[PDB]
């Protein structure tokens, strides 16, 4: 009776191409600019800039109209590459958008009202080319295409026509550029600049595309200074370029940090030095007298080009990888913020903002999890030095080769994360690096974002050396079972090259909110619970019978346990009970479970599942010795001790999957895990891979990395459910992509998190006068 | 974009004996006054109604002090022998004083010249005189005649009721604060008797056996009363005739008690107790009469009181000693044409449809180290740390912010002899404390890593390094011997 | 009582034989609260740890039976355990510092 679905959205998924700087933001404003049309990897979201709500969502997988374009278990390079606001089929009549994809399909889709069940799609007669973008002007349409020596791409521009047979678009082929390094197109789309690599060095060429108004070219050594040729490669590497709507000036942003406005009629340059790390994004205003720039500091500057006067916007929760003016008068700035505190995923925030008071009108974001490993051709962006948050000017190619080789050859292919569900309002809490994204999945939009550690997380955009510092990692957070308190555990890391650089700090914090306010308040924090330098392998919230669900149980890798509980008298969360053993072996294969009665605790340390009581907090004892088995040595270190109900409990370890009853005190069932989950997850992550219910079963979950005719970069997910002590596989589902976390929301459903973050779920006269007046008064 | 997060002051794990809210409130009773009396201060009462004056009974005079100047506004000196008790009526209009000749004399307060009536009580000394707290026209006087009397102040010839029954030296009365027929009296044989006045009155309805001779009995609730006598005080539920708390936290006999309710305090109720050894202590009736604060005085404290529940001004704790002096600790508390031109600036939007509010709140002023860390002046932030008038946690938090945030080395690059001596001269003081010494360790380690040649050149920081060496030698002897004590009580588990 | 003033005048005496037989003549039911007062004072004032821990080692040596027969040693004199743990926890750090 169980069914699988994908219900909640994913990442925004901009243009993931190299060699396109500037315009990688494929989101559009309307012409009556009241609603903002952004694509996702699962749908087209249409937000409304007046109310900040999503007003229409064109789900791709909802219908075979364009899920037939892509539903593949292996091929996601079919990507959505441009949206246009008009109708390319019939002119002069717009409330519907024409989307060009990266392969050659052109779908015309109505976003006003219900989506039509047969769109106006075509497929243009295209070569092996892969659709860089399209371009619009008055009337006419251009398209640009990429190609196949030194690994560079090659671009080719066509013009379109449609009219004679209404199935095909005919193309014209204006010109080519046989090696392209970097490219940008002006705001009106009237001209485009790019780089060449034609010999001693590269070259720079600008060309108007909708007319032969201008096309010029020059070697960029005449742009570059004489100082830069005896300096580092960052001083001559260029990471951004932009042109204005006349083609009079051009902004070259270098990886050293400087910007240079060249004047294209005479090739005289002007240097703008503010960015202390690499310049990642440039744009001009419409009149060309203001330059927006963004880089590795999280500060959008806008340069008054008359007096060279900056106006700043300093703390933008992500580095600006694209910025551009947007309106007809330039009243909005649209930005893409890369949010690079997690190195395991490229998670972009889309943020336009009105230019008047510089307030974030309609910030857009998908769910932000942090996986244990890097995911799928993910490259942290360019910078000046090779850090733990970026990579230098040399190591991008070697890093992507190494990451592909690591996904192919290696063995510890576990990129699984912990997500929690607030048991009051059913929104899920992705712990980002030193912060949490509170995010509700019945509308897939972020509730808010909150910093929970004390780093330099928000106060400062870190740059070239300072990116080798990391803010403290939130590794555990659990809610108490009434949703009143949030327990979180963080590892505070020290900066290198000093005496205390090799001892971490471990901080356990206790947060509270009432059911109205969206952000939590720290009521207490304990630095070094369990002692100095010792971690917390597992925290477990307590059931509703110990201190009215206001207790937590933290576990060491010594096998020590600490029971903390909130008492109202001394109005704080204090240390109630303690059981510390002092071994000389450590292992982070620790798990914990509690009886629902609140009587006995199952402490699943490595190779050993001890049974403690709660009243004296030592190992369980009955003096009558009624086969009081209070330890279960298993064949390997155990990583889940999940007790489904008070009768029995499922243990999962790295070879087998046992189940043990306690009203009949022996093993009842066992399963084989070693052919599936062998040495691929880190020890302590099967607890987030498998989960349970409170009545209706238990969920195992395995992963098959697919194969060719060697493993590949492609994955498939095999989730299985069991009811009532491993009896029947009454659910055997297969998902087309890697699965990272599964967990039971508190109303008999199980949510899971796809590796590209789609949350899925497994569940159970006067009439004509009225019409013409609503026409003529609108 | 956000606002900038403030620099969080480094708080360590809390040490034992922190400052409780109760002891912060009771510690801001300061600016003590010591007034030398002619003899031992035996009783002190407060005016109830405008609760702003208090009468101190020394020998053969009663002085009303004011609660804003703490000088004697008025004084009552026409007693023949030692005056013993002096209390105000519940309306605060007149003042009764029992005298050692058994002559209760009641004047009106704030007029010492008009003695209103002189009740001639027993020939024995009358030791306690107080009006009813519900009724206005009855006055209860107990004496060294082992019999208390209720007097109607209209008929002041015969007592309207004669509460006998106690075997030795009745020294205290009390009234029960909701039932006005209920008088609890306390004597030097223990045995708090208490009487229903509608009955005969020559027999108590029951008796509470405080084992020591009681010195005072007050009533806290309408139900529970507290009797002090001997080294402890006990509390008694009165609907169930039964003791339920006893605190014996003194060395000598508790001489007096009084009680406060509903006043502006973290403590919702407070019983303070004065105990012949110097101590007056405050006990909180809501968590099981636990002691929260105390004062030590320069001799045996004979009587004490505080300002009443509705004091509304300068609030007082007074304690009169057996040494013969009085200690008060208080806690304190353009043109019409131009205005017609600038009329509207106080309107605040009452009849107006929409009311817009985007004036941001003005936050606390940034200190110089915080704005220098904001302006990325990291060496200037270190310089602003080591000014003299800086708090120790503030120097610690700017050191920790430069440690976590950027670079110790950046903050220490351009230095020499004259500009390192503040850092090391503070590191001498910071190496002693537990909370600072990790940061002091890595800062000293970095500065000797990158200034090892200035060590050779300048001799006047060589001696600073030597003093730092002997400091770390003392501290490492301390951190070794603490581990030895840790082992030697690990042995005793 | 809780008399900090004459507690200070009794433990500013620092002759070792006086401290020794003083704690010997002390009643063992309140050695635990003498040890609590000493623990809180060396927690607050850090230069007292030199002179006052002479008192705390003599209280353990003499009353070695009472506070081994007490059922919760760590729960009853927690402040001593926390003070000595935070005093001796950083010993490797200032070892590296003085090296």
């Amino acid at each position: 009776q169980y069914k699988l679905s994908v219900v909640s959205g994913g990442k925004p998924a901009l243009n993931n191409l190299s060699s396109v700087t500037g315009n990688k933001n494929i989101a559009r404003l309307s012409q009556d600019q009241r609603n903002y049309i952004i694509p996702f990897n699962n749908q087209i979201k249409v937000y409304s800039v007046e109310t900040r709500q999503c007003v229409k969502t064109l789900k791709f997988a909802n219908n075979s109209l364009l899920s037939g374009i892509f539903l593949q278990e292996e091929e996601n390079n079919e990507s959505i590459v441009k949206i246009l606001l008009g109708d390319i089929t019939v002119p002069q009549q717009a409330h519907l958008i024409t989307v060009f994809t990266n392969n050659g399909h052109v779908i015309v889709l109505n976003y006003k009202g219900k989506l039509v069940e047969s769109p106006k799609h075509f497929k243009i007669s295209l070569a092996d080319e892969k659709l860089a973008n399209v371009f619009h002007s008055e009337g006419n349409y251009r398209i640009l295409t990429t190609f196949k020596h030194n690994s560079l791409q090659s671009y080719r521009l066509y013009a379109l026509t449609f009219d004679d047979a209404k199935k095909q678009f005919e193309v014209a082929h204006q010109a080519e550029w046989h090696n392209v390094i970097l490219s940008n197109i002006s705001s009106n789309g009237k001209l485009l600049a790019h780089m060449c690599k034609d010999v001693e060095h590269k070259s720079i060429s600008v060309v108007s595309l909708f007319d032969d108004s201008v096309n010029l070219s020059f070697p960029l050594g005449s742009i570059l200074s004489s100082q830069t040729q005896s300096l580092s490669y960052n001083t001559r590497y260029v990471s951004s370029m932009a042109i204005d709507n006349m083609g009079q000036q051009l902004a070259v942003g270098f990886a050293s940090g400087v910007i240079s406005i060249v004047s294209l009629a005479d090739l005289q340059i002007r240097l703008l030095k503010w960015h202390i790390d690499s310049v990642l994004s440039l744009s001009f205003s419409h009149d060309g007298s203001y330059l927006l720039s963004g880089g590795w500091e999280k500060v959008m500057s806008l340069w008054q080009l008359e007096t060279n006067s900056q106006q700043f916007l300093p703390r933008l929760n992500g580095i600006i990888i694209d910025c551009q003016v947007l309106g007809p008068q330039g009243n909005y700035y649209s930005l893409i913020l890369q949010m690079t505190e997690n190195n395991s995923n490229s998670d972009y925030q889309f943020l336009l903002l009105n230019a008047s008071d510089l307030t974030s009108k309609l910030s857009i974001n998908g769910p932000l999890p942090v996986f244990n490993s890097t995911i799928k051709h993910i490259q942290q962006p360019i910078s000046a030095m090779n850090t733990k948050n970026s990579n230098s000017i040399t190591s991008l190619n070697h890093s992507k080769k190494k990451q592909s080789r690591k996904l192919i050859k290696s063995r510890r292919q576990d990129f699984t994360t912990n997500v929690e569900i607030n048991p009051i309002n059913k929104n899920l809490y992705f712990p980002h690096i030193s912060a949490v994204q509170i995010f509700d999945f019945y509308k897939n939009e972020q509730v808010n974002y909150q910093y929970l550690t004390s780093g330099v997380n928000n106060s400062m955009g870190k740059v070239r050396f300072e990116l080798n510092l990391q803010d403290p990692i939130i590794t555990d957070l659990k809610f108490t079972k009434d949703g009143q308190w949030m327990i979180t555990y963080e590892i505070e890391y020290p900066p290198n090259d000093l005496l205390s650089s090799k001892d971490l700090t471990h901080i356990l914090k206790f947060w509270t909110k009432n059911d109205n306010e969206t952000n939590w308040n720290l009521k207490t924090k304990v630095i070094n619970p369990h002692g100095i330098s010792v971690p917390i392998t597992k925290i477990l919230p307590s059931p509703r019978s110990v201190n009215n669900s206001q207790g937590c149980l933290t576990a060491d890798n010594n096998g020590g346990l600490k029971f903390w509980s909130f008492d109202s008298h001394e109005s704080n969360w204090c240390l109630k009970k303690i059981s510390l053993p002092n071994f000389n072996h450590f292992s982070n294969s620790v798990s914990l479970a509690w009886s629902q009665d609140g009587s006995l605790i199952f402490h699943g340390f490595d190779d050993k599942l001890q049974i403690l009581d709660f009243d004296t907090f030592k190992k369980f004892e009955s003096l009558e010795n009624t086969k009081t088995v209070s330890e279960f040595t298993l064949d390997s270190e155990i990583q889940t001790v999940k007790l489904i109900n008070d009768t029995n409990l499922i243990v999962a370890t790295r070879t087998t999957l046992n189940a043990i009853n306690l009203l009949r005190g022996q093993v009842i069932n066992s399963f084989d895990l070693y052919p599936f989950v062998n040495g691929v997850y880190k020890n302590g992550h099967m607890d987030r891979l498998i989960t349970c219910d409170e009545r209706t079963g238990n969920i195992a979950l395995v992963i098959n990395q697919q194969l060719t005719d060697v493993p590949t970069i492609n994955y498939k997910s095999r989730i299985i459910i069991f009811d009532s002590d491993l009896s029947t596989k009454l659910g055997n589902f297969t998902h087309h992509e890697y699965i990272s976390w599964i967990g039971w929301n508190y109303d008999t459903d199980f949510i899971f998190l796809d590796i590209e973050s789609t949350l899925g779920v497994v569940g159970t006269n006067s009439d004509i006068f009225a019409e013409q007046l609503h026409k003529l008064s609108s | 974009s956000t606002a900038r997060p403030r620099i969080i002051t480094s708080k360590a794990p809390l040490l034992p004996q922190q400052t409780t809210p109760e002891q912060r409130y009771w510690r801001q009773y300061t600016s003590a006054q010591l007034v030398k009396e002619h003899n031992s201060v035996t009783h002190i009462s407060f005016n109830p109604q405008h609760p702003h004056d208090f009468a101190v009974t020394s020998s053969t005079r009663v002085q009303i002090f004011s609660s804003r100047t703490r000088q004697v506004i008025k004084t009552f000196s026409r007693f023949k022998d030692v005056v013993y008790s002096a209390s105000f009526r519940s309306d605060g209009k007149l003042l009764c004083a029992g005298d050692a000749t058994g002559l209760v004399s009641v004047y009106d307060s704030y007029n010492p010249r008009t003695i209103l009536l002189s009740i001639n009580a027993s020939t024995h000394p009358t030791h306690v005189t107080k009006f009813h707290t519900q009724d206005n026209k009855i006055l209860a006087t107990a004496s060294d005649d082992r019999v208390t009397r209720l007097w109607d102040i209209s008929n002041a010839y015969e007592p309207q009721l004669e509460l006998t029954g106690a075997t030795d030296y009745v020294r205290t009365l009390s009234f029960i604060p909701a039932a006005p027929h209920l008088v609890a009296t306390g004597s030097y044989d223990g045995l708090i008797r208490l009487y229903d006045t509608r009955s005969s009155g020559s027999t108590p309805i029951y008796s509470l056996n405080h084992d020591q001779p009681v010195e005072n009995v007050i009533a806290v609730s309408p139900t529970q009363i507290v009797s002090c006598g001997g080294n402890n005080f006990k509390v008694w539920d009165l609907t169930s005739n039964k003791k339920l708390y006893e605190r014996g936290n003194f060395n000598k006999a508790v001489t007096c008690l009084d009680y406060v309710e509903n006043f502006d305090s973290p403590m919702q109720s407070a019983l303070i107790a004065s105990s012949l050894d110097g101590h007056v202590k405050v006990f909180d009736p809501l968590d099981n009469f636990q002691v929260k604060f105390g004062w030590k005085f320069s001799g045996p404290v004979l009587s004490c009181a505080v300002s009443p529940s509705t004091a509304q001004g300068n609030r007082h704790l007074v304690a009169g000693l057996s040494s013969g002096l009085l200690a008060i600790r208080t806690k304190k508390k353009k043109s019409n044409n131009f205005q017609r031109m600038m009329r509207g600036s106080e309107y605040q939007g009452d009849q107006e449809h929409i009311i817009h509010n985007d004036k941001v709140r003005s936050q606390r002023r940034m200190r110089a180290f915080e704005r220098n860390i904001n302006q990325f002046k990291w060496s200037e932030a270190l310089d602003n740390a080591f000014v003299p008038g800086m708090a120790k946690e503030l120097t610690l938090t700017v050191l920790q912010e430069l440690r976590k945030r950027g670079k110790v080395r950046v903050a220490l690059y351009g230095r020499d002899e004259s500009t390192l001596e503040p850092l090391l001269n503070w590191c001498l003081k910071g190496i002693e404390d537990v909370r600072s010494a990790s940061i002091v360790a890595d800062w000293v380690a970095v500065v000797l890593e990158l200034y090892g040649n200035t060590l050779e050149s300048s001799p006047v920081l060589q001696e600073l390094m030597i003093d730092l060496k002997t400091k770390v030698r003392h501290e490492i002897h301390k951190s070794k011997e603490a581990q030895r004590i840790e082992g030697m009580l690990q042995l005793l588990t | 009582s809780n008399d900090h003033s004459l507690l200070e005048t009794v433990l500013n005496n620092r002759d070792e034989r006086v401290i020794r037989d003083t704690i010997f003549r002390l009643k063992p039911a309140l050695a635990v609260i003498l040890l609590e007062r000493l623990a809180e004072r060396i927690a607050r004032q850090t230069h007292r740890q030199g002179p006052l821990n002479v008192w705390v080692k003599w209280c353990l040596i003499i009353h070695g039976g009472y506070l081994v027969s007490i059922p919760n040693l760590m729960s009853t004199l927690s402040s001593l355990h926390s003070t000595l743990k935070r005093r001796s926890d950083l010993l490797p750090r200032l070892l590296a510092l003085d090296a």
Binding site: T359, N458, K525, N528, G531 | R6, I8 | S75
Partner: peptide, 25 residues
């Protein structure tokens, strides 16, 4: 304050304790 602006970190009057105060049994 803005809706995209993250919540800053603020301890406030949170009681910072260690893991070694065994003041409770």
């Amino acid at each position: 304050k803005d809706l995209a602006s993250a919540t800053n970190y603020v301890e406030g009057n949170a009681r910072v304790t260690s893991g070694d105060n065994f003041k409770h049994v």
